[PDB]
PDB file of C-alpha atoms in Angstrom:
ATOM      1  CA  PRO A 183      12.832  -5.132  -3.025  1.00 35.60           C
ATOM      2  CA  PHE A 184      12.111  -2.046  -4.318  1.00 34.94           C
ATOM      3  CA  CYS A 185      12.690   1.638  -2.205  1.00 31.91           C
ATOM      4  CA  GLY A 186      10.862   4.526  -3.941  1.00 31.53           C
ATOM      5  CA  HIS A 187      11.521   8.170  -2.675  1.00 29.39           C
ATOM      6  CA  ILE A 188       8.774  10.499  -2.050  1.00 30.43           C
ATOM      7  CA  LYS A 189       9.975  14.227  -2.242  1.00 31.41           C
ATOM      8  CA  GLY A 190       9.039  16.252   0.539  1.00 35.19           C
ATOM      9  CA  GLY A 191       7.120  13.278   2.170  1.00 33.87           C
ATOM     10  CA  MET A 192       3.123  12.982   1.804  1.00 33.38           C
ATOM     11  CA  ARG A 193       0.955  15.520   2.283  1.00 31.21           C
ATOM     12  CA  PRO A 194      -3.292  16.293   1.247  1.00 32.19           C
ATOM     13  CA  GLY A 195      -4.076  15.651  -1.990  1.00 31.28           C
ATOM     14  CA  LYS A 196      -1.194  13.904  -2.671  1.00 31.92           C
ATOM     15  CA  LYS A 197      -1.403  10.983  -4.653  1.00 32.39           C
ATOM     16  CA  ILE A 198       0.620   8.095  -5.414  1.00 31.74           C
ATOM     17  CA  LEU A 199       0.247   5.270  -8.445  1.00 30.28           C
ATOM     18  CA  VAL A 200       1.664   2.422  -8.506  1.00 33.40           C
ATOM     19  CA  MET A 201       1.261  -0.503 -11.652  1.00 35.71           C
ATOM     20  CA  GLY A 202       2.230  -3.824 -12.490  1.00 31.74           C
ATOM     21  CA  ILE A 203       1.473  -7.436 -13.364  1.00 30.83           C
ATOM     22  CA  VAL A 204       1.066 -10.089 -10.907  1.00 34.06           C
ATOM     23  CA  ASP A 205       3.011 -12.957 -11.320  1.00 31.03           C
ATOM     24  CA  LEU A 206       1.585 -15.901 -12.550  1.00 30.53           C
ATOM     25  CA  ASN A 207       1.114 -18.009  -9.585  1.00 29.15           C
ATOM     26  CA  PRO A 208       1.430 -14.715  -6.628  1.00 29.62           C
ATOM     27  CA  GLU A 209       1.478 -15.909  -2.724  1.00 31.00           C
ATOM     28  CA  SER A 210       1.677 -12.658  -1.875  1.00 33.82           C
ATOM     29  CA  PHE A 211       3.054  -8.839  -2.025  1.00 33.50           C
ATOM     30  CA  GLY A 212       3.323  -5.751  -0.456  1.00 35.69           C
ATOM     31  CA  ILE A 213       3.291  -1.440  -0.953  1.00 34.53           C
ATOM     32  CA  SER A 214       4.417   0.276   1.776  1.00 35.85           C
ATOM     33  CA  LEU A 215       4.704   3.768   2.639  1.00 38.26           C
ATOM     34  CA  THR A 216       7.690   4.473   5.494  1.00 40.44           C
ATOM     35  CA  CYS A 217       9.382   6.746   6.920  1.00 41.16           C
ATOM     36  CA  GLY A 218      12.422   6.886   5.491  1.00 42.86           C
ATOM     37  CA  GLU A 219      14.549   3.865   3.859  1.00 45.52           C
ATOM     38  CA  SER A 220      16.684   1.596   6.378  1.00 45.50           C
ATOM     39  CA  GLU A 221      14.920  -2.448   6.330  1.00 44.20           C
ATOM     40  CA  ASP A 222      17.665  -2.754   9.588  1.00 43.18           C
ATOM     41  CA  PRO A 223      16.710  -1.442  11.603  1.00 42.78           C
ATOM     42  CA  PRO A 224      12.864  -1.248   9.308  1.00 43.26           C
ATOM     43  CA  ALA A 225      11.765   1.821   8.697  1.00 44.54           C
ATOM     44  CA  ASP A 226       8.579   2.944  10.933  1.00 49.22           C
ATOM     45  CA  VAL A 227       5.362   1.485   8.604  1.00 48.24           C
ATOM     46  CA  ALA A 228       2.658   4.327   8.190  1.00 45.94           C
ATOM     47  CA  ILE A 229       0.501   1.643   5.716  1.00 42.45           C
ATOM     48  CA  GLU A 230       1.364  -0.822   4.353  1.00 39.14           C
ATOM     49  CA  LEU A 231      -0.732  -2.983   1.925  1.00 37.86           C
ATOM     50  CA  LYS A 232      -0.299  -6.742   1.780  1.00 37.50           C
ATOM     51  CA  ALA A 233      -2.250  -8.870  -0.800  1.00 36.06           C
ATOM     52  CA  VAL A 234      -2.723 -12.215   0.178  1.00 35.59           C
ATOM     53  CA  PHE A 235      -3.538 -14.552  -2.122  1.00 37.03           C
ATOM     54  CA  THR A 236      -4.553 -17.645  -0.882  1.00 35.32           C
ATOM     55  CA  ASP A 237      -7.081 -16.241   1.398  1.00 36.12           C
ATOM     56  CA  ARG A 238      -7.890 -13.494  -1.052  1.00 36.51           C
ATOM     57  CA  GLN A 239      -6.981 -11.211   1.162  1.00 36.20           C
ATOM     58  CA  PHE A 240      -6.211  -7.504   1.524  1.00 33.98           C
ATOM     59  CA  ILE A 241      -4.634  -6.785   4.405  1.00 31.67           C
ATOM     60  CA  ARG A 242      -3.440  -2.752   6.281  1.00 29.68           C
ATOM     61  CA  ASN A 243      -1.732  -2.107   8.941  1.00 28.34           C
ATOM     62  CA  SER A 244       0.560   0.078  10.554  1.00 27.67           C
ATOM     63  CA  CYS A 245       4.130  -0.097  12.101  1.00 29.87           C
ATOM     64  CA  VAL A 246       5.822   1.900  14.741  1.00 28.20           C
ATOM     65  CA  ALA A 247       9.208   1.551  16.611  1.00 25.93           C
ATOM     66  CA  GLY A 248       8.607  -2.495  16.042  1.00 28.50           C
ATOM     67  CA  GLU A 249       4.468  -2.456  17.195  1.00 29.65           C
ATOM     68  CA  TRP A 250       2.732  -3.081  15.134  1.00 31.62           C
ATOM     69  CA  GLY A 251      -1.287  -2.260  14.940  1.00 32.20           C
ATOM     70  CA  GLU A 252      -4.721  -3.872  14.719  1.00 33.41           C
ATOM     71  CA  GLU A 253      -4.710  -4.972  11.386  1.00 36.86           C
ATOM     72  CA  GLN A 254      -7.104  -4.236   9.116  1.00 35.04           C
ATOM     73  CA  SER A 255      -8.896  -6.119   6.401  1.00 33.69           C
ATOM     74  CA  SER A 256     -12.586  -4.515   5.431  1.00 32.20           C
ATOM     75  CA  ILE A 257     -12.892  -5.520   1.955  1.00 30.37           C
ATOM     76  CA  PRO A 258     -15.231  -5.975  -0.867  1.00 30.69           C
ATOM     77  CA  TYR A 259     -13.689  -8.102  -3.156  1.00 33.83           C
ATOM     78  CA  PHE A 260     -10.467  -9.211  -4.129  1.00 34.40           C
ATOM     79  CA  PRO A 261      -8.597  -6.567  -6.648  1.00 31.89           C
ATOM     80  CA  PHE A 262      -6.027  -8.266  -7.773  1.00 35.35           C
ATOM     81  CA  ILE A 263      -5.899 -11.230 -10.731  1.00 36.15           C
ATOM     82  CA  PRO A 264      -2.441 -13.459 -10.930  1.00 41.78           C
ATOM     83  CA  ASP A 265      -0.991 -12.607 -14.715  1.00 43.80           C
ATOM     84  CA  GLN A 266      -2.520  -9.506 -14.418  1.00 43.48           C
ATOM     85  CA  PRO A 267      -2.229  -5.527 -14.978  1.00 44.36           C
ATOM     86  CA  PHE A 268      -2.946  -3.596 -12.084  1.00 47.09           C
ATOM     87  CA  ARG A 269      -3.053   0.217 -10.691  1.00 44.18           C
ATOM     88  CA  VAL A 270      -2.857   0.947  -6.880  1.00 46.21           C
ATOM     89  CA  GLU A 271      -3.058   4.904  -6.094  1.00 46.86           C
ATOM     90  CA  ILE A 272      -3.211   6.017  -2.653  1.00 48.40           C
ATOM     91  CA  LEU A 273      -4.423   9.552  -1.912  1.00 48.42           C
ATOM     92  CA  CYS A 274      -3.698  10.846   1.071  1.00 48.84           C
ATOM     93  CA  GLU A 275      -5.951  13.148   2.972  1.00 51.72           C
ATOM     94  CA  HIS A 276      -5.691  15.392   6.521  1.00 49.66           C
ATOM     95  CA  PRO A 277      -7.414  12.173   8.724  1.00 49.50           C
ATOM     96  CA  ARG A 278      -6.652   9.500   6.268  1.00 50.51           C
ATOM     97  CA  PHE A 279      -5.566   7.574   3.334  1.00 52.50           C
ATOM     98  CA  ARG A 280      -8.395   6.449   0.558  1.00 50.53           C
ATOM     99  CA  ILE A 281      -7.290   3.274  -1.052  1.00 52.99           C
ATOM    100  CA  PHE A 282      -7.932   2.934  -5.626  1.00 48.29           C
ATOM    101  CA  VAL A 283      -7.304  -0.231  -7.012  1.00 46.86           C
ATOM    102  CA  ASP A 284      -8.251   0.128 -10.946  1.00 43.15           C
ATOM    103  CA  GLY A 285     -10.233   3.148 -10.371  1.00 44.23           C
ATOM    104  CA  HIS A 286     -12.214   1.915  -7.559  1.00 43.31           C
ATOM    105  CA  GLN A 287     -12.061   2.741  -3.560  1.00 41.20           C
ATOM    106  CA  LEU A 288     -11.437  -0.316  -2.387  1.00 39.15           C
ATOM    107  CA  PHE A 289     -11.391   1.396   2.162  1.00 37.88           C
ATOM    108  CA  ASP A 290      -9.522   3.986   4.077  1.00 39.52           C
ATOM    109  CA  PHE A 291      -7.122   3.816   6.545  1.00 39.12           C
ATOM    110  CA  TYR A 292      -6.803   6.502   8.930  1.00 38.63           C
ATOM    111  CA  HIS A 293      -3.175   7.957  10.064  1.00 38.93           C
ATOM    112  CA  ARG A 294      -1.595   5.992  12.830  1.00 37.25           C
ATOM    113  CA  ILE A 295       2.123   7.932  12.009  1.00 33.78           C
ATOM    114  CA  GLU A 296       0.490  11.824  11.305  1.00 33.43           C
ATOM    115  CA  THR A 297       3.303  13.307  10.462  1.00 31.98           C
ATOM    116  CA  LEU A 298       2.169  13.250   6.967  1.00 27.54           C
ATOM    117  CA  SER A 299       5.470  14.980   6.177  1.00 27.39           C
ATOM    118  CA  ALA A 300       7.781  12.607   7.520  1.00 28.25           C
ATOM    119  CA  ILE A 301       6.459   9.185   5.563  1.00 32.43           C
ATOM    120  CA  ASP A 302       8.667   9.567   2.331  1.00 32.72           C
ATOM    121  CA  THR A 303       9.987   6.564   0.956  1.00 35.24           C
ATOM    122  CA  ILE A 304       7.455   3.564  -0.943  1.00 30.44           C
ATOM    123  CA  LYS A 305       8.525  -0.158  -0.549  1.00 32.02           C
ATOM    124  CA  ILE A 306       7.479  -2.835  -2.983  1.00 28.36           C
ATOM    125  CA  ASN A 307       7.680  -6.104  -2.643  1.00 28.73           C
ATOM    126  CA  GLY A 308       6.435 -10.029  -3.662  1.00 29.27           C
ATOM    127  CA  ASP A 309       5.043 -11.538  -6.577  1.00 28.51           C
ATOM    128  CA  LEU A 310       4.959  -9.175  -8.687  1.00 26.48           C
ATOM    129  CA  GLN A 311       6.896  -6.784 -11.858  1.00 23.78           C
ATOM    130  CA  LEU A 312       6.540  -2.838 -10.878  1.00 26.09           C
ATOM    131  CA  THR A 313       6.146  -1.662 -14.373  1.00 27.98           C
ATOM    132  CA  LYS A 314       5.295   2.002 -13.667  1.00 26.08           C
ATOM    133  CA  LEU A 315       4.973   4.675 -10.692  1.00 26.72           C
ATOM    134  CA  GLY A 316       4.669   8.164  -9.895  1.00 26.61           C
TER     135      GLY A 316
END
């Protein structure tokens, strides 16, 4: 798995760009914004985005002190295709993240972790090749 540092953490108006290529026979991948890079014990998770290909879900949740929140799943469509490039953009606003895939807003996620400047790590894992981070 991969960790990228976000200098200064998140703040309103800041946008994280992730581009990659989905694997040919994917099961799932994840893109998370976390408070630090620790894997053991796991850093608190401000937002995890998990693409699950078997039932075409794009699920979101947060994790604080080991406790996951309420999973959110509403989607207009499942935006990823095996073997195809994608662009995910996470826009931070004061009340919420807004998530865009290939330029289109898919959903918002209202902050559970409200110390946005502590959200200083992007973690990427699973059945993709990561091609750009910005």
